[PDB]
Amino acid sequence: MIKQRTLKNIIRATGVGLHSGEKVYLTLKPAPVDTGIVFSRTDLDPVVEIPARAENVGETTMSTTLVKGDVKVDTVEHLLSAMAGLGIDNAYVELSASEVPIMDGSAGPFVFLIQSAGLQEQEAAKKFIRIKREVSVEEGDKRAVFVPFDGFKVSFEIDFDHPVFRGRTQQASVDFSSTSFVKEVSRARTFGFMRDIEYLRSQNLALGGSVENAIVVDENRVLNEDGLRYEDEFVKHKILDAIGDLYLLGNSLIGEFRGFKSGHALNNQLLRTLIADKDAWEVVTFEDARTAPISY
Numbered sequence: 001m002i003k004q005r006t007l008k009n010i011i012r013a014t015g016v017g018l019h020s021g022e023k024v025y026l027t028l029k030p031a032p033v034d035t036g037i038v039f040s041r042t043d044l045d046p047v048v049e050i051p052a053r054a055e056n057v058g059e060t061t062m063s064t065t066l067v068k069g070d071v072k073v074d075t076v077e078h079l080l081s082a083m084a085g086l087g088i089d090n091a092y093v094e095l096s097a098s099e100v101p102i103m104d105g106s107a108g109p110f111v112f113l114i115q116s117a118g119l120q121e122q123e124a125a126k127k128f129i130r131i132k133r134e135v136s137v138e139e140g141d142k143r144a145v146f147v148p149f150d151g152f153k154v155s156f157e158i159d160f161d162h163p164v165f166r167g168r169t170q171q172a173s174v175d176f177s178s179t180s181f182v183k184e185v186s187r188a189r190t191f192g193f194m195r196d197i198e199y200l201r202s203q204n205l206a207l208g209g210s211v212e213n214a215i216v217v218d219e220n221r222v223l224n225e226d227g228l229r230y231e232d233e234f235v236k237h238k239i240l241d242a243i244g245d246l247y248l249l250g251n252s253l254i255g256e257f258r259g260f261k262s263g264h265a266l267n268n269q270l271l272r273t274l275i276a277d278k279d280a281w282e283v284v285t286f287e288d289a290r291t292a293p294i295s296y
């Protein structure tokens with residue numbers, strides 16, 4: 001059978017919050033079967049736990065924020081993207097502040113931590129959510145869709161008209177039958193438009209952002225000296241972001257996500273809309289791994 005997966009060891013890192021600019025301590029820990037990913041604010045007294053589930057998402061402007069009452073954990077999407085990519089079902093994530101550290105802007109540092117912690121198979125079947133019917137949500141010209149697919153595929157199209165994007169692919173469809181999340185998606189850095197970052201900074205926001213943790217473009221050029229990690233890094237990051245949001249379903253997906261100019265708000269609307277319609281999905285397990293359309 002395909003088994004649930006957790007970490008073998010506790011592991012730690014530090015970094016700064018993209019929004020706050022202040023140092024945060026991160027800890028990833030093993031967790032029992034059927035725990036899911038649970039975030040804990042260990043700086044608070046009492047300590048506050050927030051399960052990484054779609055129903056606990058509050059704000060979704062630019063980042064995905066988990067909320068419980070007045071307590072928040074911001075910017076969960078890149079870490080969760082790594083958890084999803086490596087098929088980690090169960091883990092505890094401890095944080096000394098209200099935001100996951102931005103690290104290098106990608107999911108790579110989290111992939112690194114999870115792999116370094118080691119992968120532990122657990123004595124319970126891994127559950128998957130299989131999409132049975134296509135479901136979509138829209139806002140203006142933005143669209144996010146789940147489509148049935150015998151495997152796991154994430155497709156995305158961005159549609160920027162600024163000169164710096166002219167001639168760029170702005171589209172990718174990744175079938176994880178033959179694409180490595182680790183090698184080909186996880187290291188895509190977050191990006192921002194210079195004018196938008198200036199606006200954030202003018203309000204004392206985005207204080208942790210730098211060219212060392214984000215690709216910054218003006219109307220016409222990429223500001224980062226070293227260029228891009230992947231030829232299509234921008235759309236790959238959107239794919240990364242979508243995989244992280246997808247993991248808030250609480251189980252790995254058998255299906256396809258398609259994004260069109262979509263962001264965290266629409267991604268989360270899609271999750272809640274899917275979850276609510278039981279005719280459109282089912283939970284499956286694989287007692288024989290060789291018969292499965294995915295592999296971890």
Ligand SMILES: C[C@](O)(c1ccc(O)cc1)[C@H](NC(=O)c1ccc(C#CC#Cc2ccc(N)cc2)cc1)C(=O)NO
Nearest residue numbers: 062063077190191192193197206209210211214216241
């Ligand atoms: C990628 C993302 O999805 C997104 C969402 C909306 C959008 O319009 C574009 C990108 C969205 N991006 C961010 O929220 C984002 C990305 C970059 C920054 C920044 C910065 C900086 C800086 C800096 C640069 C130069 C100097 N000299 C100093 C400081 C802030 C936030 C994302 O990745 N969310 O998961």
Ligand SMILES: [Zn+2]
Nearest residue numbers: 161162163219
């Ligand atoms: Zn423009």
Ligand SMILES: [Zn+2]
Nearest residue numbers: 077078190241
């Ligand atoms: Zn992102």
Ligand SMILES: [Zn+2]
Nearest residue numbers: 268269272273
């Ligand atoms: Zn909704």
